[PDB]
Design a protein around this ligand. Structure first.
Ligand SMILES: CNCCCN1c2ccccc2CCc2ccccc21
Ligand SMILES: CNCCCN1c2ccccc2CCc2ccccc21
Ligand SMILES: [Cl-]
Ligand SMILES: [K+]
Length: 548
C-alpha cells in the first residue's frame, strides 16, 4: 500500500491540463516530430535539475516562494516575480477550464452539436462531408467552437473585444466558486477522491489512442508525427516553444513546487519524485501527441485537405480535435461526457495547486494573511475571476493568446535563470549539496551539480537572449495583431521580469552600512547575519566560486 499510494500520487500530479491541451497544439504548430528533439533535450537538461532544485529548496527551507530567499536576501525579487507569473497564468487557465465545462454541458444530448451543421450558429459557408492555406474554420466542429462557444465572429480584432459571453460568464463563475470552496479551508485536500482522477485521464488517452490508430487516415498523421523536419530545428521558434512548454508543464519556475515541498517530510526523497514526475511527464506528452496526430491525420483524410490546414494552431486545437474523434465512437454521447468530465476534473485539480502557490507564498510573507486565509483566498480568487472575465469576451481568444504568449514565456525563463544563478552561484552549490545530504542522507551526483551550476544557466540564458532578439509579431490564424498589442504583451512580460532589479535596489538602499557591509548583508543568510560583523564572508573568497 505504501508504494502503490506513492505511485498513484505522483501519477496524478503529472498529467495535468498542460499535457493534454497545450502540448498538442504546440507540437502541431511546430511540425510534430521536429518538436520532440528540443522538447526532450530541454526536459532533461533544464527541467530535471530545476524540478529537483525547487523541491530540495522548498523541503529544506520550509518556506514559500517569496520567503525561501532568506538564504540570499537579494532574490526575494525573483520570488515575487514567480508569484506574479503564477497569478497571471490563472487568468486564462480558468478560462480554458470554463470552456471545458461548457463543452461538458453541451455534450448532454443524443445529437452532439459538433457532428453536423445547420444550427443557429452555423454560417452559410459550412461544409459537411457526410451531408455532401487557410485553417478551414468551416467544418461543423470548427464552426461550433468558433461561433457557438467563443462567439468570435462578433469581434473583428483585439480592438473590438466586446462584452463577456453570459454562458462563459456563468461557467467561469462556477469554476471560480469551486476553486474558492476547495482552497479556503487549507492546503490539505488529497487522499479522498484522487483515485478516480489519478487514472481517468490515462484510461481516456488509452481508449482514444486505440480508436484513433484504427482510422482511415491515421497512418498519414502518424507518419507526419514521427517525421523530423530538420529545417525546423534552425529557426529558434521551436526551441523557445519547447523550453516554455517544458517549464510550464513540469511546473518549475512558478513558485508552486517550493510552496508544496515546504510541507513535505524532512526525510522525503526529492530525487525520486523529480525523476518519476519527469519520466511520466515525457511519456504522457509523447502518447498524447501520438493520439492527436492520428486524429488530425484522420481529419485530413476525411476533409480532402492537406494535413497542415485541417485545424487551427491556436489554443482551440484540442477542443476542435477531440470532438471529431468522439463523433467516430459508438455511443458518442457517453464518451463525450466521460472525456469532458475528465478534462474538467483535471483542470480543477491543476488550478487548485496553481492558486495555492500564490496564496501560500504571499501568506508566508505577511502573518496577517496567514491568520486570515479565508479573506485572502477570496481576494485572490476574485481578482483572478475579474481578470479572467476580461478574457471571455467576444474577442476574448485574442486576449487569451496574448496572455498565453507573454505571461509565462521569456518571463519564466528569466525567473528560472535567476533562481538557478542565485541559488548555485551565490548561496553555494556545495552548500546546497550539503543541505540535500542532511535531508535525504546522500549527496547529489556530479551531473546534478554541473547542471545546476553551468549547463542549465547557459541553456536558459541562450534561450532568453534568442527569444528577446528573435521575436515574431503575434498572430492568430489569419489575424495579425496591431503593434500596440505586441507592446502590451512585452509590458506584461516586463511587469514580472523587472521585479528582480527593483528589489535588489530596494534591499541595497534599505540596508544600513558601508558598500561592502551592504553587499555582505545582501548576500548572507538572514540567520547567518551575525558573522558579517566578524568579517568572514564565504562569498568574498575564490573558493566559494570555484566549488562544484
Ligand atoms: C510524499 N510527498 C511527495 C510526493 C507527492 N507530492 C508530489 C509528487 C511529485 C511532485 C510534486 C509533489 C508536490 C506535493 C504533492 C501534491 C499533491 C500530490 C502529490 C504531491
Ligand atoms: C504544471 N503545468 C501547469 C498546470 C497549471 N499550473 C497553474 C495553474 C493555475 C495557476 C498557475 C499555475 C502555475 C504552474 C503550476 C504549478 C503547479 C501546478 C499547476 C500549475
Ligand atoms: Cl508537456
Ligand atoms: K504536467
Amino acid at each position: 500500500g505504501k508504494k502503490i499510494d506513492f505511485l498513484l500520487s505522483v501519477v496524478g500530479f503529472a498529467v495535468d491540463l498542460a499535457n493534454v491541451w497545450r502540448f498538442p497544439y504546440l507540437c502541431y504548430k511546430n511540425g510534430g516530430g521536429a518538436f520532440l528533439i528540443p522538447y526532450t533535450l530541454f526536459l532533461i537538461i533544464a527541467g530535471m535539475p530545476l524540478f529537483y532544485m525547487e523541491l530540495a529548496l522548498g523541503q529544506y527551507n520550509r518556506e514559500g516562494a517569496a520567503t525561501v530567499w532568506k538564504i540570499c536576501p537579494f532574490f526575494k525579487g525573483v520570488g515575487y516575480a514567480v508569484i506574479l507569473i503564477a497569478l497571471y497564468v490563472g487568468f486564462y487557465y480558468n478560462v480554458i477550464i470554463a470552456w471545458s465545462l461548457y463543452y461538458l454541458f453541451s455534450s448532454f444530448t443524443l445529437n452532439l452539436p459538433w457532428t453536423d451543421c445547420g444550427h443557429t450558429w452555423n454560417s452559410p459557408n459550412c461544409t459537411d462531408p457526410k451531408l455532401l492555406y487557410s485553417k478551414y474554420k468551416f467544418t461543423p466542429a470548427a464552426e461550433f467552437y468558433e461561433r457557438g462557444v467563443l462567439h468570435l465572429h462578433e469581434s473583428s480584432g483585439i480592438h473590438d473585444i466586446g462584452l463577456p459571453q453570459w454562458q462563459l460568464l456563468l461557467c467561469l463563475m462556477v469554476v471560480v466558486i469551486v476553486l474558492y470552496f476547495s482552497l479556503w479551508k487549507g492546503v490539505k485536500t488529497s487522499g479522498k477522491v484522487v483515485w478516480i482522477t489519478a487514472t481517468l485521464p490515462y484510461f481516456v488517452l488509452f481508449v482514444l489512442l486505440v480508436h484513433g490508430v484504427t482510422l482511415p487516415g491515421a497512418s498519414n498523421g502518424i507518419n507526419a508525427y514521427l517525421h523530423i523536419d530538420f529545417y525546423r530545428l534552425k529557426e529558434a521558434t521551436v526551441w523557445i516553444d519547447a523550453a516554455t512548454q517544458i517549464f510550464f508543464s513540469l511546473g518549475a519556475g512558478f513558485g508552486v513546487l517550493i510552496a508544496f515541498a515546504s510541507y513535505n517530510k524532512f526525510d522525503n526523497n526529492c530525487y525520486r519524485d523529480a525523476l518519476l514526475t519527469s519520466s511520466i511527464n515525457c511519456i504522457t506528452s509523447f502518447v498524447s501527441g501520438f493520439a492527436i496526430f492520428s486524429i488530425l491525420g484522420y481529419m485530413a483524410h476525411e476533409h480532402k485537405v492537406n494535413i497542415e490546414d485541417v485545424a487551427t494552431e491556436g489554443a482551440g486545437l484540442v477542443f476542435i480535435l477531440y470532438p471529431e474523434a468522439i463523433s467516430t465512437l459508438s455511443g458518442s454521447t457517453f464518451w463525450a461526457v466521460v472525456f469532458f468530465v475528465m478534462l474538467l476534473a483535471l483542470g480543477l485539480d491543476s488550478s487548485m495547486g496553481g492558486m495555492e502557490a500564490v496564496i501560500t507564498g504571499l501568506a508566508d510573507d505577511f502573518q496577517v494573511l496567514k491568520r486570515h486565509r479565508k479573506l485572502f483566498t477570496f481576494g485572490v480568487t476574485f481578482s483572478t475571476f475579474l481578470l479572467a472575465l476580461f478574457c471571455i469576451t467576444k474577442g476574448g481568444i485574442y486576449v487569451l493568446t496574448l496572455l498565453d504568449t507573454f505571461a509565462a514565456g521569456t518571463s519564466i525563463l528569466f525567473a528560472v535563470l535567476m533562481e538557478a544563478i542565485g541559488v548555485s552561484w551565490f548561496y553555494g552549490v556545495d552548500r546546497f549539496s550539503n543541505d540535500i545530504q542532511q535531508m535525504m542522507g546522500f549527496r547529489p551526483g556530479l551531473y546534478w551539480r554541473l547542471c545546476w551550476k553551468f549547463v542549465s544557466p547557459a541553456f536558459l540564458l541562450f534561450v532568453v537572449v534568442v527569444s528577446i532578439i528573435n521575436f515574431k509579431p503575434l498572430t492568430y490564424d489569419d489575424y495579425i495583431f496591431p503593434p500596440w498589442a505586441n507592446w502590451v504583451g512585452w509590458g506584461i512580460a516586463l511587469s514580472s521580469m523587472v521585479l528582480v532589479p527593483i528589489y535588489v535596489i530596494y534591499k541595497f538602499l534599505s540596508t544600513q552600512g558601508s558598500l561592502w557591509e551592504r553587499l555582505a548583508y545582501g548576500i548572507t543568510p538572514e540567520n547567518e547575519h551575525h558573522l558579517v560583523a566578524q568579517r568572514d564572508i564565504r562569498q568574498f573568497q575564490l573558493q566559494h566560486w570555484l566549488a562544484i
